[PDB]
Structures are given as structure tokens and as C-alpha cells.
Design a protein around this nucleic acid. Structure first.
Lengths: 75, 52, 328
RNA sequence: GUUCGAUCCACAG
RNA sequence: CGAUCCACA
């Protein structure tokens, strides 16, 4: 359980965007606080000390995750 | 199109240098035909503005 | 606010009694035109349309060069500074590729965003930024990052943003723009892109178009005039103007051109702050480019030491015969 | 980073 | 033998 941060917004290109303080690997699995599958890390970018993260939502309607804290799940 | 101002050098989107008042041209140079169909032509008037 | 090139190094004197024979070599300035060409670089302003290779290809054919190359690829829709080293100077592009670049960009946004926010987000992207996200690893891996030295937003009209950006070699502005757009939600793409700097070469009086370049060359072959064509071509030294330099003495020049590495005792003077492994330009005391190499010592070690190998010579540019064999 | 040519085998006093 | 220069994968 590796806290990413709050979902800033849903991007038109179809990606949840989180600002964070570390670097997730490509394809890490992403979950919410109640622990459910939300999508996968597809891009990391911006300042190394404080990266933006782009998540491909593997969920029906993602626009409902803004404001929500997402987590990466090693195992 | 990215425009350039011939006097100040300044780069702009506008038709009039907001730093040198002058009219702006496109920043990109012109296309170049590799066989340069009309090169001896361009060279003809070029010779007469350099004094050649 | 500026590239690393732009930082001026200090010059340490090692042999303060070192002098140079005017009979040997050729300062860039007083090079005969044909020789000037043989060791030249053109600060070319590439046109939208061709691939960087096609451009060079044309230059080859039109000037009848046996070879040439360019100093950092520009994509076909892109214009601006494209250094083209000719003939015997061709390999100097190696000193250019690593070099910092400056562009002027047009970003088109896919939705509407206030300016206060466009400025603010864009400054998040100055500094060390992430290029390729890492891959899942069982061990601490290397992470791909490039530096953005400065982003200066020039003006904003609506969805269209025009900015100047200085970056480390290997930074894709197309990619920067996409990432920025992603960070503003609406998305974005690159409308236009012009290169305004490539290491030492910039938009100045020496920057010449394909049209002028060919025209000036005809003005020489047909009209017997060398002044214009000469002005279009720069001394390869220019290409090496952003690198740290070790100036050797005349006694050492032919040794280097004959395949010796540069030993400490051959050194007359050097730039401060050379780290082992850095790219260095070895120069004549008349400021001719003798060769490029990797530093095997630091400025300090080079300065203090009295024997040893200072620089591993990698590429030699100067003709074996400009300075006499003075060794052994 | 591997094939035979060319030059040299050079601490620069 | 080793470097550098030149040509070819």
C-alpha cells in the first residue's frame, strides 16, 4: 500500500491525473481507500521530486474519482 | 504561425512587433527546391543588390 | 535562465612561458578558402519540409562535398538552427549532440484554461523532469530524466500558447507539451516548433539560409568572389566553443595527430573544473582544434601533476603535417 | 564494438 | 603490439 495522492482531475485524453512525491513504475496497479481496482499507471512525468501520474481507468465511470486518494499495490 | 520581428528579433504570434513597432514576417525560412529550378534567376537580381 | 554552455570557465595557466611558432598551423581566420571549407561548419537555418538528412544530402551535392553531417536532428515540420559540419570537420558534430538546445514553441490546448494557471503549471516543468517512466524492477534501476533549464512564456492568445524553452539534449518538446496538456486536463499538442540555439550556434549574423548558402557559393565559383561564401562557413572551432579546453604546446601537436594520447607535460593551459571522463577539446596555442578526447584527469590533477596521461584522444581533426614531429 | 591498407609508436626539454 | 587517419559490415 503505497499512497499516491489525490486525483487532481480526469483528463480529456482519458486519464486520471495525480500529483505525488515518488515514481511509480509503468503498469503498477492502482486502488482506492476501500481497496478496489481503479486502473493502471501509464505515464509518469513532471518534476522528479514531485511527479504527475497518468492512470488508465479500468473502471466504468472514472470522473467520480476526482478528489479521491489513490494507492499503488505491490502485492 | 510563429512570427518574428525583423528589428528587435523578438518572437510573436502578432502582426506587429510589440517591442519594435515593425511589421512581422514568418520565422521559418522559405522552402528550397533541391534542383533549384529558378536559381540562376534568383542569382541574377541578387547580384545587383550586392553590387556584383 | 540560460544553458550550461553559457557558463564561462576559468583559464588556469600551467606553462606561462609557452609560445607558438607562426610558421606552424593555421589560425581559423587566416585559412585559405578551400581549406576553410575543408574544416568548416555552416550555421544553417533549415526550412520546414525536409528531413535533416535530406538537407545535408543536398548540401553535399550542391557544394560537391565528399561528406558532411548535422548537429542534432530536426523533425521535417521544424525549422531553425541546424549546424552542418563539412568534409574533414564532419565528425565535430559529436561535440554538438550532447549540447543544450533552445526552442520557440507553439502549444495548442484542447480546451479552455485561465492564463494564471497556464503560467503556474508551466513552471512546474522547469528543472529535472521525468522522460520515460521506469519499468517494474526487482532491483534499483536507472530512471530517465532530462533538465529543462528555463521555460519563458512569450504570449498567450486564447487556446494558443507561445513559449521559449531551453533544454538538455534528448528532450522532446512534443513530449513536454503533451505532458503539460495532461497536467492542465484539457490536453495539448505542438502547433509549430523552431530551434533557436544548438550549443554554441544561435540566431545571429552567421545564421544562413539554404538559398543564400548556394547563392554565395555560386558567387565564388562563377564570379571569383570568396568573401560571401567564406562568411557562410564557420571555423570548426566554433563547434567546440562550449566544451572545456586543454591548450597544448607546439611540441605536442604532431604527437597527438600521429595517435599519441595527450600527456600532462604537453599542456600549456586548461579550463578549470574538468572532471575525469568529460569531453574535452584539445587546442593549439593559436586556438586551432587539434582533437576531441575524454579527460583521464581533473583540471587539478592536470595542473599539479608533472607526468601521466591527461586526455585520451578519441577523434583527431588536424592534419598530421601542420606541425613538425618534435618528440623523442 | 569486428576486416587489410595509411601514419606513427610519441611524457612534448 | 597499441593509438590515430582512411574504406567496408
Amino acid at each position: 500500500m503505497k499512497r499516491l495522492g489525490k486525483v487532481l482531475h480526469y483528463a480529456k485524453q482519458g486519464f486520471l491525473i495525480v500529483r505525488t512525491n515518488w515514481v511509480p513504475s509503468l503498469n503498477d496497479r492502482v486502488v482506492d481507500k476501500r481497496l478496489q481496482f481503479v486502473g493502471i499507471v501509464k505515464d509518469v512525468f513532471g518534476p522528479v521530486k514531485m511527479p504527475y501520474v497518468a492512470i488508465k481507468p479500468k473502471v466504468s465511470n472514472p470522473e467520480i474519482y476526482v478528489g479521491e486518494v489513490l494507492y499503488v499495490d505491490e502485492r | 504561425r510563429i512570427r518574428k520581428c525583423p528589428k528587435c528579433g523578438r518572437y510573436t504570434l502578432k502582426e506587429v512587433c510589440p517591442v519594435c513597432g515593425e511589421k512581422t514576417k514568418v520565422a521559418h525560412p522559405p522552402r528550397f527546391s533541391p534542383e533549384d529550378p529558378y536559381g540562376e534567376y534568383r542569382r541574377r537580381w541578387k547580384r545587383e543588390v550586392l553590387g556584383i | 535562465r540560460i544553458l550550461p554552455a553559457d557558463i564561462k570557465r576559468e583559464v588556469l595557466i600551467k606553462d606561462e612561458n609557452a609560445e607558438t611558432n607562426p610558421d606552424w598551423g593555421f589560425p581559423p581566420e587566416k585559412r585559405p578558402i578551400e581549406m576553410h571549407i575543408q574544416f568548416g561548419v555552416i550555421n544553417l537555418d533549415k526550412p520546414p519540409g525536409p528531413t535533416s538528412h535530406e538537407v545535408v544530402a543536398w548540401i553535399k551535392k550542391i557544394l560537391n562535398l565528399e561528406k558532411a553531417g548535422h548537429g542534432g536532428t530536426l523533425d521535417p515540420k521544424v525549422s531553425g538552427v541546424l549546424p552542418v559540419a563539412l568534409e574533414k570537420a564532419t565528425r565535430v558534430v559529436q561535440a554538438l549532440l550532447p549540447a543544450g538546445k533552445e526552442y520557440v514553441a507553439l502549444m495548442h490546448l484542447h480546451g479552455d484554461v485561465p492564463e494564471d494557471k497556464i503560467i503556474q503549471v508551466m513552471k512546474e516543468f522547469e528543472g529535472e523532469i521525468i522522460q520515460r517512466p521506469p519499468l517494474r524492477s526487482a532491483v534499483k534501476r536507472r530512471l530517465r530524466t532530462r533538465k529543462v533549464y528555463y521555460i519563458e512564456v512569450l504570449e498567450i492568445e486564447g487556446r494558443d500558447v507561445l513559449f521559449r524553452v531551453g533544454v538538455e539534449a534528448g528532450t522532446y518538446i512534443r513530449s513536454l507539451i503533451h505532458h503539460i496538456g495532461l497536467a492542465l486536463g484539457v490536453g495539448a499538442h505542438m502547433s509549430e516548433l523552431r530551434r533557436t540555439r544548438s550549443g554554441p550556434f544561435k540566431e545571429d549574423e552567421t545564421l544562413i539560409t539554404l538559398h543564400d548558402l548556394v547563392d554565395y557559393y555560386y558567387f565564388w565559383k562563377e564570379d571569383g568572389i570568396e568573401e560571401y561564401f567564406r562568411k557562410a562557413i564557420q571555423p570548426m572551432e566554433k563547434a567546440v566553443e562550449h566544451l572545456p579546453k586543454v591548450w597544448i604546446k607546439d611540441s605536442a601537436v604532431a604527437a597527438v595527430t600521429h595517435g599519441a594520447d595527450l600527456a600532462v607535460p604537453g599542456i600549456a593551459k586548461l579550463h578549470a573544473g574538468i572532471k575525469r571522463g568529460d569531453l574535452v577539446a584539445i587546442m593549439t596555442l593559436k586556438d586551432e582544434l587539434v582533437a576531441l578526447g575524454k579527460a583521464m584527469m581533473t583540471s587539478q590533477e592536470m595542473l599539479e601533476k608533472t607526468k601521466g596521461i591527461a586526455v585520451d584522444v578519441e577523434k583527431v581533426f588536424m592534419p598530421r603535417d601542420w606541425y613538425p614531429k618534435l618528440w623523442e
